[PDB]
Write a protein that binds this ligand. Structure first.
Ligand SMILES: [Ca+2]
Ligand SMILES: [Ca+2]
Ligand SMILES: [Ca+2]
Ligand SMILES: [Ca+2]
Ligand SMILES: [Ca+2]
Ligand SMILES: [Ca+2]
Ligand SMILES: [Cl-]
Ligand SMILES: [Cl-]
Ligand SMILES: [Cl-]
Ligand SMILES: [Cl-]
Ligand SMILES: [Cl-]
Ligand SMILES: [Cl-]
Ligand SMILES: [Cl-]
Ligand SMILES: [Cl-]
Ligand SMILES: [Cl-]
Ligand SMILES: [Cl-]
Ligand SMILES: [Cl-]
Ligand SMILES: [Cl-]
Ligand SMILES: [Cl-]
Ligand code: NA
Length: 669
């Protein structure tokens, strides 16, 4: 029930369904859609759900130590080729969100996949693509609803799609409302389509999926996404994260998504720096730690982000013609770092390939004897047994250009990892300090990567040792049920009053103490040392801290939580006749915390004014509580943050729920 809201202890294995294993040749496409031997990487090669099942049953997947399978969209895709030859093998060209892609299997096959994975305590995460259907030149973006045609893109009579110009090299607004490439953009703000997408995700939730990866989150309004994910949490909460492509430093909009959307993201900052330094020999370990420190600060919930060192949209981590020890090192780093690690299928067998679709070759073999496979076997389990790995912060204990020694800790549990990325040089490590208790520690990798023991003294010091070329050593300390409560994760990370939420950590004690949101006491459903289930309080919402006090009276760290006012709907706010001077933007502010609780510092915006409406009309799609008295005003804010308020009284509105809405006013000057 809340069994899927916390992935901190999971290790994800990411499969491109068509490219993993053809378990059922009979469901293979025939003719131009199919590539025999997978010689044309733009076509279907035959990988299917039976193939994944086969590799669970054989032990290949569960024996690796992975605990979750993240797979391609399971929904029916277009059956014709793009005019340039491209096929829908990847699942991102939907035609019916209520049906299976019959090339992957039927609903019975899907159920068998779910049942088989669950039988081995493996979770199943699916891609979900609410942004678009298919390339417009194939079938005019055809959308079906369990076999019933809803409509097409170019001939759209019901505003089911967005049909705006462009776009090339877009700004944020254009990135959202104009088409992604040549893909038919769904109009999520249209009540019928919003309802359809909700019915669709609910169907898949009903099949037993355990998590969702939302595609193209950089191309949909954050307000719509917040309302949508809130409805997912209402219905059947599962861990949800989005793919927002970005670079080492991320971006303003990316960070807002990570911290404010209600879901987490793929950690592209982590991935891009790992590729820079480890894969491509750009920069040094100093760049890796800069990234760790920076992201620890910038992300409200580092433990919720999904980390990776490669994926379906960047170069394979394994470089052709190079010592594969580097991939082993990359995996060790990934598995012991903060955030939920996602291993890309075939990394463990050193598959190579640059770009798309070069990075999506057919799974080569199923070799359990690679060093990489063994590395995963040794380290994946740590996340379930050691709370420092699942929830801990990160500290640098030793560093030079080639070496990083980092420590994670959580309520008395510890991890210490030493990595030397230079395969040609060894380094003498002197002056190392650690907070781990005094004792001799043995390498968790069992010297798989040339690791060694560590003797820690009472004062935290360690005798000099030689860190060999390409060496990784992993050391850990696990303590009993900690003293002092510490919260490691809260899931879902957002909710409305009455919603059940799970607080995970340790040191809570065996008997109910107290839980608070801000200064409001919360109802406890269940309580043990590592897990407390609560129901969210009816009190002023917004982003505030949840804190736990044990029965001994000791209070925990505060943990950021987003309390909603009620059931959310995506509402487009439109304001006419809002003239601004250069450098100024219009923002929306209002009574409920969804609208900033009257605080300009927390206002919604800057609003848009190019695509759906034109200046001096501005607009924005905002998640607001339904069946709630809303009062709001628009403000004009300059580059220094100076605020000028709309004159007169508040605009009042009440969203008579069950659907998206639009509310429109004229700016009072
Ligand atoms: Ca097949
Ligand atoms: Ca079977
Ligand atoms: Ca058609
Ligand atoms: Ca869009
Ligand atoms: Ca309609
Ligand atoms: Ca030296
Ligand atoms: Cl549960
Ligand atoms: Cl062929
Ligand atoms: Cl993108
Ligand atoms: Cl450099
Ligand atoms: Cl060298
Ligand atoms: Cl310290
Ligand atoms: Cl919710
Ligand atoms: Cl106790
Ligand atoms: Cl207990
Ligand atoms: Cl500006
Ligand atoms: Cl004020
Ligand atoms: Cl009310
Ligand atoms: Cl109107
Ligand atoms: Na919003």
């Amino acid at each position: 029930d809340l069994s899927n809201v916390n992935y901190a202890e999971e290790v994800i294995y990411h499969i491109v369904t068509d490219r993993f294993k053809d378990g059922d040749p009979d469901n293979n496409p025939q003719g131009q859609l199919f590539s025999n031997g997978c010689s044309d990487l733009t076509k279907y090669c035959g990988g299917d759900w039976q193939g994944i099942i086969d590799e669970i049953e054989s032990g290949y997947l569960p024996d690796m130590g992975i605990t979750a399978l993240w797979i391609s969209p399971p929904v029916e895709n277009v059956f014709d080729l793009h005019p340039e030859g491209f096929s829908s093998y990847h699942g991102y060209w939907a035609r019916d969100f209520k049906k299976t892609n019959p090339f992957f299997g039927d609903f019975d096959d899907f159920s068998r996949l779910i049942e088989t994975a669950h039988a081995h305590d493996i979770k199943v995460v699916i891609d979900f693509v609410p942004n678009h259907t298919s390339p417009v030149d194939i079938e005019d973006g055809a959308l079906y609803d369990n076999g019933t045609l809803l409509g097409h893109y170019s001939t759209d009579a019901n505003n089911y799609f967005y049909n705006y110009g462009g776009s090339d090299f877009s700004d944020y607004e254009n990135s959202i409302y104009r088409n992604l490439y040549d893909l038919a953009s769904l109009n999520q703000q249209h009540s019928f389509i919003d309802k359809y997408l909700k019915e669709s995700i609910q169907l898949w939730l009903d099949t037993g999926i355990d998590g969702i990866r939302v595609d193209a989150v950089a191309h949909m309004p954050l307000g719509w996404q917040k309302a949508f994910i809130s409805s997912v949490y209402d219905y059947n909460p599962v861990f949800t994260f989005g793919e927002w492509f970005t670079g080492a430093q991320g971006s303003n909009h990316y960070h807002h998504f990570v911290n404010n959307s209600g879901m987490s993201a793929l950690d592209f900052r982590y991935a891009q720096v790992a590729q820079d330094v480890l894969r491509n020999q750009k920069g040094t370990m100093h760049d890796i730690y800069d990234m760790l420190a920076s992201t620890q600060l910038d992300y409200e919930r580092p433990q919720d982000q999904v980390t990776f060192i490669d994926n379906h949209d960047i170069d394979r981590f394994t470089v052709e013609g190079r010592d594969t020890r580097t991939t082993d090192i990359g995996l060790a780093f990934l598995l012991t770092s903060r955030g939920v690690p996602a291993i890309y299928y075939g990394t463990e067998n050193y598959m190579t390939g640059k770009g798309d679709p070069g990075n999506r070759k057919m799974m080569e073999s199923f070799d359990q004897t690679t060093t990489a496979y063994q590395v995963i076997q040794k380290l994946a389990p740590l996340r379930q047994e050691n709370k420092a790995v699942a929830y801990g912060s990160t500290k640098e204990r030793w560093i030079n250009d080639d070496v990083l020694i980092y420590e994670r800790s959580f309520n008395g549990d510890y991890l210490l990892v030493a990595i030397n990325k230079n395969v040609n040089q060894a380094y003498t490590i002197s002056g190392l300090l650690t907070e781990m208790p005094a004792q001799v520690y043995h390498d968790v990798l069992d010297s798989l990567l040339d690791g060694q023991s560590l003797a820690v003294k009472e004062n935290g010091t360690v005798d000099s040792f030689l860190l060999g070329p390409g060496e990784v050593s992993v050391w850990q300390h696990i303590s009993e049920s900690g003293s002092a409560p510490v919260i490691g994760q809260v899931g879902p990370p957002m909710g409305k009053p009455g919603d059940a939420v799970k607080i995970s950590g340790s040191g809570f004690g065996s008997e109910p103490g107290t839980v608070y949101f801000r200064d409001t006491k919360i109802d406890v459903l269940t309580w043990d040392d590592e897990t407390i289930v609560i129901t969210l309080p009816e009190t002023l919402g917004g982003k505030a801290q949840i804190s736990v006090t044990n029965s001994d009276g000791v209070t925990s760290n505060g943990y950021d939580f987003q309390l909603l006012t009620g059931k959310q709907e995506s509402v487009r706010f439109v304001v006419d006749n809002a003239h601004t001077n250069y450098g100024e933007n219009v923002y929306l502010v209002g009574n409920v915390p969804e609208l900033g609780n009257w605080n300009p510092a927390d206002a919604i915006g800057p609003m848009f004014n190019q695509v759906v409406y034109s200046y001096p009309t501005w607009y924005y799609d905002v998640s607001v509580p339904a069946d709630t008295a809303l009062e709001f005003k628009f403000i004009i804010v300059d580059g220094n943050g100076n605020v000028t308020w709309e004159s007169g009284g508040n605009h009042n509105y009440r969203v008579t729920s069950g659907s998206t809405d639009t509310v429109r006013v004229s700016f009072r000057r």
